[PDB]
Design a protein around this ligand. Structure first.
Ligand code: CLA
Ligand code: CLA
Ligand code: CLA
Ligand code: CLA
Ligand code: PL9
Ligand code: LMG
Ligand code: LMG
Ligand code: LMG
Ligand code: LMG
Ligand code: LHG
Ligand code: BCR
Ligand code: OEX
Ligand code: FE2
Lengths: 51, 52, 52, 30, 334, 35, 245, 42, 51, 153, 93, 38, 42
C-alpha cells in the first residue's frame, strides 16, 4: 500500500472516471477520513493496506 | 557497427574494465592456493603430486 | 587450385585434430598409469560413494 | 488452438526425461 | 583450506550426481542458452527473411506450423557470414527479422558440444578409465560442425546453413544434392556403408549375445533377470556364439577375441562418419562428387544416356527451383 | 544494445576464466591413482 | 561532403557512414543556370509513420503511429540526376536517373510488418521563385511502381508474368462450372502503380561550393502484394542534400 | 482447417496407453510392498 | 469497441489492474505506443510465473 | 452418367493419401451431374485431345495433343517466350452431352478453365458445401482394404 | 495476370510488340540486335511504328533495319509488369 | 536422501467401492454431457 | 453446431477419472496377493 499503490516506489492502481471513458494507471494518494470507506474511492484501498 | 576491426569486439572503453575484472577476479582466487608457492621446486616425474 | 587446397589441407586439419585427441588421451593416461586398463584388485569405482 | 496440443506434447515429453534421469531406479550390488 | 581448493574439490568431484568438471564450466552455460533460446524460437518466433529478398519464411508454431514444418530459420542472405549478435542489431525486432536466433543457437551449440566431448574425457580420467570414448563422439561432432559451421563458411553465408527443423532438413538435403551431387561423392558412399554396416554389426552382435544366454531364470519371469548387477560371472557362453557364426559363414571369419570384436564395433561407424563429415567439408568448397553426364557416346558421337543422366535430370529439377526468386544471373555461384 | 553487451562479456570471461584456471589448478594430479 | 571524400573505402565500410547524407554548411543564394543539371541528390528519411486506427481515450480517429525500421541500413537514395528546367514563374526539377528506389520494411505495434518501396521515380518538383534560397520549398508527385516485379513467384508458384495461375496442390478446386473463382483474387496478380507526394525544403546553401540541403517530408502508399491486401498510407520525414552544379 | 477428430486421436493416444503403463508399475510396487510385510502390506 | 473483457480475458484484467499496460509486441491497452516495456510486460509476467 | 463417372481420376484408388481421412465425398463433394464431353478444336479445325494425368503425378501441366502425338497447345508456365499458348493457337471447346449439351466457348479465359479440368478424366459438377469438402482426393475402400490386410500380412 | 491478351505478340508470333517485348524478341530480326534493338527497348511508351522514328539518336542505318521490319513491328497496350523486364526478364539459353 | 519415512501407509479400494466410483463418473457423464455439447 | 471442445470434456471426463479408480483397485488386489505368499506374490 505504501510503495506499489501510492506510487512512491510503484506504478499504482488502474483508476478511471465515473463513466468508464478515461482510465490510466496512476499513483493514488490515500484518503484517511470516512471517505476511505467509500469503496469506489481508490484512495481507500491505499489507506487500507497502509493502515 | 559490426565489421569494424576492433580488438576482441571492444567497441567502448567500458568493456575493457569488464574483461580485466573477470580474469583477475578468478586469478586472485587461484593465487590464494597455487600462488605464493615455491617457484624453485622440481621433479623428475611426468606429473607432479606436490601439494594442494 | 583453390578448391584443391581448401579441400585437402582442410581434410587433413581435421584428422590432426583427431591426432590431438588420441595422442593426448593416451599421454595423459600413460602418465597416470591406467592406459593398460583397470586393475582387477583395485577398482577405483568401488572405493567411491553410493551411486545415486 | 491447434498449436496448444503440440506444445503440450513437447513439454510433456521433457517431463518424463526429467523423471527418468533424477528419479531413476538406482542399481545396487548385493 | 583455501576457497579455490574447496571449489576445485567440488567441481571435479565424481560424487556429484552429474559430473560437472572443468569442461562443464563452459558446457552447461552454453548448452542451456542454446536450449532456452531454441524452445522459444521454435514455439514463438516471427518470420525470417532467409533469402535476403524480404520474403519472410515462417518457422515457428504460433505462426501456423507443426512439429514437421516448424523450424528455426537460418539467418539472412543479407547478413551472410557476418557476426550478428543482439547488441549489433539496434532492436530485437531487427534481430528477429534478419535471422537472429540461428546464430545464437548454433554458436552456443558448437561450443557446448565440443565441451560435452571434452567432458567425456575428463570423467574418464578421474574414474581410472582408458580415455577414448570422446574420440568416438568426435564423429557426430565432425558432422554437426560440417553442416552448421563449415558449410556456411565455404559457401560464404549462414543462409546456406542447415535449418534447425525437420522439413528444413530435407530442404537442406535436396538443395545440397542439386548443387553438389552428394550421392556420387565417395564419402557419402563411405558412410552409408558406415551406418548400414553399423546397424548390421549392432544387430549381429546383439543377437549372438542374446542367443547364447545361460539359464538363470524360469520361464515365468523375464529373461533379463538372470543378470545380477556387478556380478563377476560371464553371462553368456561366448564359445557357443563363436561356433554358430563359425558355421554360419565359415570358420576363419569369426572373432574369438571379444576385445577385438568390441573394437570393430567402434571402428566401422566412427571411421564411416569421420569420412562422411569430410565429404560435406570438401563439398563446402565446391569440390563436388562425380559427374558422369554425357560420358557414353556411340561412334557417331551421339550421347547415349546412362543412369547418371537420369540422375542429372533429377538434379536439374531441384537446381532450377531452389530459391526461385533469389537468383538473377544464369549460374548459381552460391 | 550496449547494456546487454556488457552483461555478456561478464558472463563469458567468468566461465572462460574458470576453465583456464581450472586446468592450471594442478589438474593432471587429480586422478584415482594417487592424490 | 568533402569531408566524406577525404576518407578511403576501408575507413568507411562497416561504420554506417555511407548510409548518411551529407551536412551542408552555411546559407546563401545560388542561381540555376540555363543548362543546370542536378548532380548528387541523396534523400534519407530519419523517421517513419504508418496511418492506423489509434486507441485514444474514447475515440478512434486515424492517426500516424511511428514504426521501427527492420531492414538495417538500406533506406537511403543516392546519385539522383536530373536537369533543372527554368519556367518563368517557378523553378522546376525533373529527375532522370540514379538509384531512386530503396525497398524497406517497418514494424508496427502488434507485430505487423509493413513493407513499402520508398521511391522518387518520375518526380516533378516545383518551387517558388528562381534561385535556391533558405526559404525555398519545392515538391511534387512521384510514381510508385509495385513492390514486386510481375515475375515474382509467390509460395505456390504464381506470378503476374510467369508461374501457374491455380492452386497447384489443390487439384479438385477447378471442378464444376464455377471452377476456382472463389479464390480468384489470389490467382490474378495485378501490377499496381500508385502516387506519392514529396515536399522538400531547402534551408542551407553553399554558393562557393554549389551544394544545397534541407528537410523534406514524403507521403506515399505501402504495397499490397499485387492486390493481396489493402495498402496503407505511409508518411516519412528526413533530410536531403543535393549538388546544384 | 484441421480435423476435429484428431484431438480425440492424439489425447486418447497419449493418455489411455500411458495411463495403462502406470498401472502395471503401481501394482508391481504394491506386490513388492505386499510381500515385504512392513508398515505397508496391510 | 473490442476491449479485453469482450474477448473473455480472465486473468488479464488482474495484470492491468495493478499497473501493467504494455506488451512486447508494442501494443498497449491504453492505446499509446511504447518503444520498450522492459521486463514487466504481459509476456514478462506470464514467463516469470512459469519460472 | 455412371459410365463416365468411372472415367474420372478422383475415383482412382491410387490418388488418395494416407493421413487424410474420411470418404471420397470429402474429396471434392457429392457429384451432381455430368457436365459433358469437351472436344477441343483449334482455329485450323483439327481435333485436340487433352493429355491425361497419370496416377503418379499430383501436379501435371495441361497439354493439348492432336491425333499423331504432336504438341499443338498447352498452358505455359513461362509466359514470355510462348510458342504454343491457347491465345496463339486459338483453341475452341465444344461440349457434347451432359448439361452443357450444345455450347461453344471461344475465348482464352474460358477455354483455359475447361482445359484444366479435362485432364482429370470426365468433367463433373460437384457439391462441396454439404460435407465441407476441402479439395484433395481420398481413396476408395478398395485402397484401404489393400492397405490394412497387406500391412497386417 | 491469369488471362492476359497479347501473349503472342511478346516473343513467338513473329509479329512483335514494341512496348512489351523482351530484347531477346528482336534477336530474330537480323540487323537490330544489339544496337537498334537497344534503343527501342530503352525508351518509353510508343503508340505506333511511326513513333520508332522519333527515337533520340537515330541514324539512317538505324532507321533502315526498322524500315525493313516495320510490317513485323507493331505496338500494343503497355501493361506495366512486362515493361519493366524488357532488358532482362531472367531468361537465358 | 535421508532415512525411510515411518509415515508410509497403504491405499485400499475394495471391489464394492470400485463400482460406486465407476457408476458415479458415468452418471455424471450422462448428466453433464448434454449441457457441455450445448 | 456443437462445441468441439466438449468431446474432450466428456471423453476425458469419463476416461481419466475412471482409469484412476481402476488403479486403486488393482494395487489393492496386488497387496492382498502380495501378503498371501502363494503363486502370485513374487
Ligand atoms: C485507515 C483505515 C482504513 C480504511 C480507510 C480501510 C478501508 C477499507 N477496508 Mg479496512 N481495515 C483497516 C483499516 C482501514 N481499512 C484495519 C486497521 C483493519 C484491521 C486489520 C481492516 C480490516 C478490514 C477488513 C477485514 C475488511 C476491510 C475492508 C475495507 C474496505 C471497506 C469498503 C469495502 O469495500 O468494504 C465492503 C464491506 C464488507 C465486505 C463487509 C464485510 C462483512 C461480511 C462480508 C459479511 C458477510 C460474512 C458472511 C460470511 C458472508 C456469507 C453470508 C451471505 C449469506 C451474505 C476499504 C478498502 C473490507 C474489504 O477489504 O472489502 C473489499 C473488509 O472486508 N478492512
Ligand atoms: C560461458 C560460456 C559461454 C560462451 C563460451 C559463450 C560464447 C558466446 N556467446 Mg554467450 N551466453 C552465455 C555463455 C556463453 N556464451 C550465457 C550464460 C548467456 C546468458 C546470459 C549468454 C548469452 C548470450 C547472448 C545473448 C549472446 C551470446 C553470444 C555469444 C557469442 C559471442 C559473445 C562474445 O563476444 O564473447 C566474448 C568473448 C571474448 C572477449 C573472447 C574471450 C576469449 C579469451 C580472451 C581466450 C583467448 C585467449 C587468448 C587468445 C590468449 C592470447 C595470448 C597472447 C600472448 C597472444 C559467443 C559464441 C552472442 C551471439 O552468439 O550472437 C550471435 C549473443 O548475442 N551469448
Ligand atoms: C539410403 C539412403 C541414405 C542413407 C543411409 C544416408 C546416410 C547418411 N547421409 Mg545421406 N543422402 C541420401 C541418402 C542416404 N544417406 C540422399 C538420397 C541424399 C540426397 C537428398 C542425401 C544427402 C545427404 C546430405 C546432404 C547429408 C547426408 C548425410 C548422411 C549421413 C547422416 C549421418 C549423420 O548426420 O549423423 C551424424 C550425427 C549428427 C549430425 C548429429 C550430431 C548431434 C550432436 C552430437 C548432439 C545433438 C544432441 C541433441 C540436440 C539432443 C540429444 C537428446 C537430448 C534429449 C539430450 C549418413 C552417412 C549427412 C552427412 O554427410 O554427414 C554430415 C549430410 O549432411 N546425406
Ligand atoms: C482393416 C481395417 C480397416 C480398414 C481398411 C478401414 C477402412 C475404412 N474405415 Mg474403418 N475402422 C476400423 C478398421 C478399418 N477401417 C476399425 C477397427 C474401427 C473401429 C475403431 C474403424 C472405425 C471407423 C470409423 C469410425 C470410420 C471409419 C472409416 C473408414 C474409411 C476411411 C478411413 C480413413 O480415411 O483412414 C484414415 C487413415 C488412418 C487412420 C491412418 C491409418 C493408421 C496409421 C497408419 C497409423 C497407425 C497407428 C499408429 C502406428 C499408432 C499411433 C499411436 C499414437 C497416436 C500414440 C475406410 C473405408 C470412416 C468412414 O468413412 O466411414 C464412413 C469413419 O467414419 N472406420
Ligand atoms: C556341377 C555343376 C552342375 C556345375 C555347375 C558348377 C557349380 C556346382 C556351381 C555352384 C557353386 C556355387 C555358386 C556355390 C558357392 C556357394 C556360395 C558361396 C554361394 C553364395 C553366393 C554368395 C554371393 C556368397 C558371398 C556372400 C557372403 C556369404 C559373404 C560373407 C560376408 C562376410 C565375410 C562377412 C563377415 C562380417 C564380419 C566380420 C562379422 C563379424 C562381426 C560381428 C559383429 C559379428 C558378431 C559376432 C561374431 C562372432 O564371431 C562372435 C563370437 C560374436 C559373439 C558376435 O557377436
Ligand atoms: C581447431 C578448431 C578451430 C579453432 C578456432 C580457430 C581459432 C579461431 C580464431 C579465434 C580468434 C581469436 C581472436 C580473439 C577472439 C575474438 O576476437 O573474438 C571476439 C569476437 C568479436 O566479437 C564481436 O566483434 C565485433 C567487432 O567486429 C562486434 O564488436 C561485436 O560486438 C563483438 O561481439 O567475438 C567472438 O567471436 C567471441 C568468442 C567467444 C568464444 C569464447 C569461447 C572460448 C572458450 C574456449 C576456452 C578458452 C581456451 C582457449 C584459450 C586458450
Ligand atoms: C487406445 C487408443 C484409442 C485411440 C486410437 C488411436 C488411433 C489413432 C489413429 C486413428 C485415428 C486417426 C484418424 C484421423 C482422425 C479423423 O478425424 O478421422 C476421422 C475419420 C472419419 O472421417 C469423418 O467421417 C465423417 C463421416 O464418416 C465426416 O465425413 C467427416 O468429415 C470425416 O472427417 O475417421 C477415420 O478415418 C477413422 C479410421 C480409423 C480406422 C483406420 C482404418 C485404417 C486402418 C488400417 C490398418 C492398417 C494398420 C496396419 C498396421 C500399421
Ligand atoms: C521488508 C519487506 C519488504 C516487502 C517484501 C519485499 C517486497 C516483496 C514484494 C514483491 C516484490 C515486488 C514485486 C516485484 C517487483 C518487481 O517487479 O521488480 C521490478 C522493479 C523494477 O522493474 C523495472 O520496472 C520497470 C517499470 O515497470 C520496467 O518494467 C523494467 O523492465 C523493470 O526492470 O524492481 C523493484 O521493484 C524491486 C524491488 C522489489 C523488492 C526487492 C526484493 C526485496 C527483498 C527484501 C527482503 C529481503 C531482506 C529482508 C531482510 C532479510
Ligand atoms: C480430468 C478431467 C479433464 C477434463 C475436465 C473436464 C471439465 C469439463 C468441463 C469444462 C469443459 C467444458 C467447457 C465447454 C467446452 C468448450 O468447448 O468450451 C470451450 C471454451 C473456450 O471457448 C472457445 O474459445 C476459443 C477462443 O478462446 C474460441 O472463441 C471458440 O469459439 C470458443 O468456443 O472453453 C472453456 O470455456 C473452458 C472453461 C473451463 C474453465 C471453467 C471456468 C468456469 C469454472 C467455474 C468454476 C466453478 C466451479 C464451482 C464448483 C462447481
Ligand atoms: C485434475 C485431476 C482430476 C482428478 C479427478 C480424480 C478423482 C475422481 C474420482 C474420485 C471420486 C471417487 C468416488 C469414489 C466412491 C467410493 O469409492 O465410495 C467409497 C467411499 C468410502 O467407502 P469406504 O470408506 O467403505 O472405503 C473403504 C476403502 O477400502 C475404499 O474406499 O464412499 C465415499 O467416499 C462416499 C460415497 C460416495 C459413493 C458414491 C455415492 C453416489 C452413488 C453414485 C450416484 C450415481 C447414481 C445416481 C443414480 C441417480
Ligand atoms: C481438454 C479440455 C480442457 C483442458 C483442460 C486442461 C488443460 C487440463 C489440464 C490439467 C492439468 C495439467 C492438471 C494437472 C494437475 C496435476 C497434479 C494434480 C499433479 C500432482 C503432482 C504431484 C502428485 C506431485 C508429486 C510430487 C513430486 C513429483 C515430487 C516430490 C513429491 C511430490 C508428492 C510433491 C478444457 C477444460 C479447457 C476445455 C475442455 C477440454
Ligand atoms: O542461399 Mn541457400 O541455396 Ca547455396 O546455392 Mn546459391 O546460395 Mn542460395 O542459391 Mn542455391
Ligand atoms: Fe557386446
Amino acid at each position: 500500500g505504501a510503495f506499489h499503490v501510492t506510487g512512491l516506489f510503484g506504478p499504482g492502481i488502474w483508476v478511471s472516471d465515473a463513466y468508464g471513458i478515461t482510465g490510466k494507471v496512476q499513483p493514488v494518494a490515500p484518503a484517511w477520513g470516512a471517505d476511505g470507506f467509500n469503496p469506489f474511492n481508490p484512495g481507500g484501498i491505499a489507506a487500507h493496506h497502509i493502515a | 557497427t559490426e565489421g569494424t576491426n576492433e580488438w576482441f569486439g571492444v567497441d567502448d572503453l567500458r568493456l575493457l574494465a569488464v574483461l580485466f575484472l573477470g580474469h583477475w577476479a578468478i586469478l586472485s582466487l587461484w593465487l590464494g592456493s597455487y600462488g605464493d608457492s615455491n617457484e624453485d621446486e622440481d621433479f623428475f616425474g611426468e606429473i607432479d603430486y606436490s601439494a594442494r | 587450385p583453390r578448391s584443391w587446397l581448401c579441400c585437402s589441407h582442410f581434410f587433413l586439419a581435421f584428422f590432426f585434430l583427431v591426432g590431438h585427441w588420441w595422442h593426448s588421451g593416451r599421454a595423459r593416461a600413460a602418465a597416470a598409469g591406467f592406459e593398460k586398463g583397470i586393475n582387477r584388485a583395485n577398482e577405483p569405482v568401488l572405493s567411491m560413494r553410493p551411486i545415486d | 488452438m491447434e498449436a496448444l496440443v503440440y506444445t503440450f506434447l513437447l513439454i510433456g515429453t521433457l517431463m518424463v526425461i526429467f523423471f527418468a534421469v533424477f528419479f531413476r531406479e538406482t542399481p545396487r550390488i548385493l | 583450506v583455501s576457497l579455490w581448493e574447496r571449489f576445485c574439490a567440488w567441481i571435479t568431484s565424481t560424487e556429484n550426481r552429474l559430473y560437472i568438471g572443468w569442461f562443464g564450466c563452459l558446457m552447461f552455460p552454453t548448452l542451456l542458452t542454446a536450449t532456452s533460446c531454441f524452445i522459444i524460437a521454435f514455439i514463438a518466433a516471427p518470420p525470417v527473411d532467409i533469402d535476403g529478398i524480404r520474403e519472410p519464411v515462417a518457422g515457428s508454431l504460433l505462426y501456423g506450423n507443426n512439429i514437421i514444418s516448424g523450424a528455426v530459420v537460418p539467418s539472412s542472405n543479407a547478413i551472410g557470414m557476418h557476426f550478428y549478435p543482439i547488441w549489433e542489431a539496434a532492436s530485437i525486432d531487427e534481430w528477429l527479422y534478419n535471422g537472429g536466433p540461428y546464430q545464437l543457437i548454433v554458436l552456443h551449440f558448437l561450443l557446448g558440444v565440443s565441451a560435452y566431448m571434452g567432458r567425456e574425457w575428463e570423467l574418464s580420467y578421474r574414474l581410472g578409465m582408458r580415455p577414448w570414448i570422446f574420440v568416438a563422439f568426435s564423429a557426430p561432432v565432425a558432422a554437426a560442425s560440417a553442416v552448421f559451421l563449415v558449410y556456411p563458411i565455404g559457401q560464404g553465408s549462414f543462409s546456406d546453413g542447415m535449418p534447425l527443423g525437420i522439413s528444413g532438413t530435407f530442404n537442406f538435403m535436396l538443395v545440397f544434392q542439386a548443387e553438389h551431387n552428394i550421392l556420387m561423392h565417395p564419402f557419402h558412399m563411405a558412410g552409408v556403408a558406415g551406418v548400414f554396416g553399423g546397424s548390421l554389426f549392432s544387430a549381429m552382435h546383439g543377437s549372438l549375445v542374446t542367443s547364447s544366454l545361460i539359464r538363470e531364470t524360469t520361464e515365468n519371469e523375464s529373461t533379463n533377470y538372470g543378470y545380477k548387477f556387478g556380478q563377476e560371472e560371464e553371462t553368456y557362453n561366448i564359445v557357443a556364439a563363436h561356433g554358430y557364426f563359425g558355421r554360419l559363414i565359415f570358420q576363419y571369419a569369426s572373432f574369438n577375441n571379444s576385445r577385438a570384436l568390441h573394437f570393430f564395433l567402434a571402428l566401422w561407424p566412427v571411421v564411416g562418419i569421420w569420412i562422411t563429415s569430410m565429404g560435406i567439408s570438401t563439398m563446402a568448397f565446391n569440390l563436388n562428387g562425380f559427374n558422369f553426364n554425357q560420358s557414353v557416346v556411340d561412334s557417331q558421337g551421339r550421347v547415349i544416356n546412362t543412369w547418371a543422366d537420369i540422375l542429372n535430370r533429377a538434379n536439374l529439377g531441384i537446381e532450377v527451383m531452389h530459391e526461385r526468386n533469389a537468383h538473377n544471373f544464369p549460374l548459381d555461384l552460391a | 544494445m550496449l547494456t546487454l553487451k556488457i552483461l555478456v562479456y561478464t558472463t563469458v570471461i567468468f566461465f572462460v576464466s574458470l576453465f583456464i584456471f581450472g586446468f592450471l589448478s594442478s589438474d593432471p594430479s587429480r586422478n584415482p591413482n594417487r592424490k | 561532403k568533402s569531408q566524406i571524400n577525404e576518407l578511403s573505402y576501408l575507413q568507411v565500410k562497416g561504420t554506417g557512414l555511407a548510409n548518411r547524407c551529407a551536412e551542408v554548411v552555411g546559407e546563401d543564394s545560388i542561381k540555376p543556370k540555363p543548362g543546370a543539371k542536378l548532380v548528387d541528390m541523396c534523400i534519407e528519411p530519419k523517421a517513419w509513420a504508418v496511418e492506423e486506427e489509434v486507441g485514444k481515450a474514447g475515440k478512434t480517429e486515424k492517426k500516424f503511429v511511428n514504426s521501427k525500421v527492420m531492414t538495417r541500413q538500406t533506406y537511403t537514395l543516392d546519385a539522383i540526376e536530373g536537369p533543372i528546367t527554368v519556367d518563368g514563374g517557378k523553378i522546376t526539377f525533373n529527375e532522370k536517373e540514379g538509384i531512386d528506389y530503396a525497398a524497406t520494411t517497418v514494424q508496427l505495434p502488434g507485430g505487423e510488418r509493413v513493407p513499402f518501396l520508398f521511391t522518387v521515380k518520375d518526380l516533378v518538383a516545383k518551387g517558388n521563385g528562381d534561385t535556391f534560397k533558405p526559404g525555398f520549398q519545392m515538391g511534387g508527385d512521384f510514381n510508385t511502381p509495385s513492390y514486386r516485379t510481375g515475375l515474382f513467384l509467390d509460395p505456390k508458384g504464381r506470378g503476374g508474368t510467369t508461374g501457374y495461375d491455380m492452386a497447384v496442390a489443390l487439384p479438385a478446386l477447378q471442378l464444376g462450372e464455377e471452377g476456382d473463382a472463389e479464390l480468384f483474387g489470389e490467382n490474378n496478380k495485378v501490377f499496381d502503380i500508385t502516387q506519392g507526394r514529396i515536399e522538400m525544403e531547402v534551408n542551407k546553401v553553399n554558393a562557393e561550393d554549389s551544394e544545397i540541403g534541407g528537410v523534406f517530408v514524403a507521403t506515399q502508399l505501402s504495397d499490397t502484394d499485387m492486390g493481396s491486401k489493402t495498402p496503407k498510407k505511409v508518411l516519412t520525414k528526413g533530410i536531403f542534400y543535393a549538388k546544384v552544379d | 482447417e484441421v480435423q476435429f477428430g484428431a484431438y480425440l486421436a492424439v489425447l486418447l493416444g497419449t493418455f489411455l496407453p500411458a495411463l495403462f503403463l502406470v498401472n502395471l508399475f503401481i501394482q508391481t510396487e504394491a506386490r513388492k510392498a505386499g510381500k515385504a510385510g512392513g508398515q505397508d502390506s496391510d | 469497441l473490442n476491449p479485453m473483457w469482450r474477448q473473455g480475458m480472465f486473468v488479464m484484467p488482474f495484470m492491468t489492474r495493478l499497473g501493467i499496460t504494455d506488451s512486447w509486441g508494442g501494443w498497449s491497452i491504453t492505446g499509446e505506443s511504447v518503444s520498450n516495456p522492459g521486463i514487466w510486460s504481459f509476456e514478462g509476467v506470464a514467463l516469470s510465473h512459469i519460472i | 452418367d455412371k459410365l463416365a463417372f468411372y472415367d474420372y481420376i478422383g475415383n482412382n484408388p491410387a490418388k488418395g493419401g494416407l493421413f487424410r481421412a474420411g470418404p471420397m465425398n470429402k474429396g471434392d463433394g457429392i457429384a451432381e451431374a455430368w457436365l459433358g464431353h469437351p472436344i477441343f478444336r483449334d482455329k485450323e479445325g483439327r481435333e485436340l485431345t487433352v493429355r491425361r494425368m497419370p496416377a503418379f503425378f499430383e501436379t501435371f501441366p495441361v497439354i493439348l495433343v492432336d491425333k499423331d502425338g504432336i504438341i499443338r497447345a498447352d498452358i505455359p508456365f513461362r509466359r514470355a517466350e510462348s510458342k504454343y499458348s491457347i491465345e496463339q493457337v486459338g483453341v475452341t471447346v465444344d461440349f457434347y452431352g451432359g448439361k452443357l449439351n450444345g455450347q461453344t466457348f471461344k475465348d482464352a479465359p474460358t477455354v483455359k478453365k475447361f482445359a484444366r479440368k479435362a485432364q482429370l478424366g470426365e468433367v463433373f459438377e460437384f457439391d462441396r458445401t454439404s460435407l465441407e469438402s476441402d479439395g484433395v482426393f481420398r481413396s476408395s475402400p478398395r485402397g484401404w482394404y489393400t492397405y490394412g490386410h497387406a500391412n497386417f500380412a | 495476370v491469369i488471362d492476359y491478351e497479347n501473349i503472342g505478340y511478346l516473343g513467338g508470333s513473329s509479329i512483335v510488340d514494341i512496348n512489351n517485348a523482351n530484347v531477346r524478341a528482336y534477336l530474330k530480326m537480323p540487323g537490330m540486335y544489339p544496337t537498334v534493338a537497344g534503343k527501342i527497348v530503352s525508351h518509353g511508351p510508343y503508340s505506333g511504328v511511326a513513333d520508332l522514328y522519333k527515337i533520340p539518336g537515330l541514324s539512317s542505318a538505324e532507321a533502315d533495319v526498322i524500315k525493313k521490319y516495320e510490317s513485323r513491328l507493331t505496338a500494343k497496350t503497355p501493361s506495366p509488369d512486362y515493361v519493366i523486364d524488357r532488358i532482362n526478364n531472367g531468361l537465358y539459353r | 536422501m535421508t532415512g525411510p519415512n515411518p509415515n508410509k501407509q497403504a491405499v485400499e479400494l475394495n471391489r464394492t467401492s470400485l463400482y460406486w466410483g465407476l457408476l458415479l463418473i458415468f452418471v455424471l457423464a450422462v448428466l453433464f454431457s448434454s449441457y457441455f455439447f450445448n
